[PDB]
Amino acid sequence: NTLVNCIATAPMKLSPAITNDANDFNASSQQVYNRLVEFKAGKIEVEPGLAERWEISEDGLVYTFYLRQNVKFHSNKTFSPTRPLNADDVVFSFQRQADKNHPYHNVSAGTYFYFNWMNLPSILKSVEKVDDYTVKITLNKPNTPFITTVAMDFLSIYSKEYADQLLAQGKPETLDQQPIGTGPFIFQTNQTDHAVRYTANVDYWKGKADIERLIFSITPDAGTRYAKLKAGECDVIDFPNISDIAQMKKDPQINLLEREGLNLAYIGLNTTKPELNNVKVRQALHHATDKKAIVDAVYQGGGTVATNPFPDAVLGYNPHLPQYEFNLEKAKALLAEAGYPNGFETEIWVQPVVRPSNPNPRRTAEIIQADWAKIGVKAKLVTHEWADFNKRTREGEFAAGTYGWTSRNGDPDNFLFPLFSQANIPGTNYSRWTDEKFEALLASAAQIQDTQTRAKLYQQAVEIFQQNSPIIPFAHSINYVPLNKRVQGFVQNPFGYTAFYGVSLKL
């Protein structure tokens, strides 16, 4: 049994702690490593990983992880472990990142993109060994999403024994280039070009994987990946051309899996601009945003109309959030009501660098421009280079624009706080909107543990946001995993990653 995974580009880094491109994770953390807790398959909730169990103190400040016993690291021709995983390995993995003086902190000229993106420098107070099987993590303030952060790829647990050996041997770089973990697959040290090869770990604590060998074959052309998948020369492909999706849905040889991405494409509105400061005007522009047309024209099937600022996989989703239905007549009337019988002139900043959240900002902008014009809003499309687009948006120069956001941990806090907190102006809160009650709900919700209590708080916060319409959500992208019919037991991951543990091959 050999699964062939055909990927578009060669993975740059085989070390999750120092990876920028989330696609590298599929070649390392996803097969070779484990985390303290792991996301349940297909879900955003966590379950025990290298921690067999954990406790959180009353105040939400202290996380205590009790480590699974008799977990072995892999070996290669350079390294054979003499002890099982313990707290030293966990402390090493966190501290390499958090402690600038740590001996491995600059190994590989490494940059801890995710540690910083998830705000651990400010959230994390300390990571301490209590005993060999107990790790105590203390936060600077309570943060419920932290438990899900711990399950993210960048917090994969490395072997300190291996790291100690390599430092002693004068080649610490090897830690990042020849990965050793506790995970379900072992990185084959003998490697060829245009491919990454793995073998099943017989000693894996969850039980040995069904598939004995994994080949990641670099196959740069989308059309070729598709062709080979039909041919059974690939079992899985990535970055399928959207043009091919419709026919893939008809192909007997293909099992096309799909689900909404944890992202949002929206029209941002600068609520400090004279006309856009007016809530009724914003509601009017919202009524004059043809979301179905946009999704239809722009995503060519690979997207869904957004009703909430996050998809229904996210905690707090509200299936009956009131909508500003597309109605130009109502839009123009609202504009008159707001004191603008002849509308006004404005700008729509077009995003110049395509992202998965929105594969065609230019066409998005054009559709909106045409409808807005019909209600007397004359919006010129404005082009900028990537860096300018971003910097002058953060600084509040824009009026309207085509923007997107992707959540990395999938928690409602990691949509609503970045987008709408006062603290993120100037910053990720492009619209500059704030509301005292809304901000209090976000803080309470981020600092409360109970799931259903959080969900109600988020639903309340989102209703306030919706009433004020500071941005106009229009789409979530759809992620696709095209599989050959032979592969069984693969579960699509909300974050987009591909894990092959638990997967089996027919025929």
Residue numbers in the entry: 8 to 514
From the article:
Based on sequence homology analyses, the bacterial SBP superfamily has been classified into 8 clusters, with cluster 5 comprising dipeptide binders (DppA family), oligopeptide binders (OppA family) and nickel specific SBP's (NikA family). Apart from GbpA and/or DppA representatives, some Pasteurellaceae also carry the genetic information for a close, although phylogenetically distinct homolog, which we have termed HbpA2 in the present paper. Interestingly, the HbpA2 clade diverged significantly from both the GbpA and DppA signature sequences. Because we were unable to identify a molecular interaction partner for these paralogous HbpA2 proteins, their in vivo role will have to await further study.
Indeed, our thermofluor analyses showed that none of the two HbpA2 proteins under study were able to interact with any of the tested type 5 SBP superfamily allocrites. The crystal structure of HbpA2Hp was determined to 2.0 Å resolution by maximum-likelihood molecular replacement. The structure reveals the two-lobe α/β-fold architecture and β-strand topology typical for SBP-like proteins, and is essentially identical to that of the structurally characterized GbpA and DppA proteins. Crystallographic refinement and exhaustive examination of residual difference electron density maps failed to provide any evidence for a bound ligand to HbpA2. Moreover, the N- and C-terminal domains were opened by about 33 degrees with respect to the GSSG-bound GbpA and glycylleucine-bound DppA reported previously, again indicating we crystallized apo-HbpA2Hp. Our structural analysis offers direct evidence that the A380P, S430T, and D432R substitutions would be grossly incompatible with GSH and GSSG binding as they would abolish electrostatic, H-bonding and hydrophobic interactions contributions critical for binding of such ligands. A similar analysis, this time against E. coli DppA, shows that R415 in HbpA2Hp takes the exact same position as the active site residue D408 in E. coli DppA, a residue that makes a salt-bridge with the amino-terminus of the bound dipeptide ligand. Thus, R415 would prevent dipeptide ligand binding.
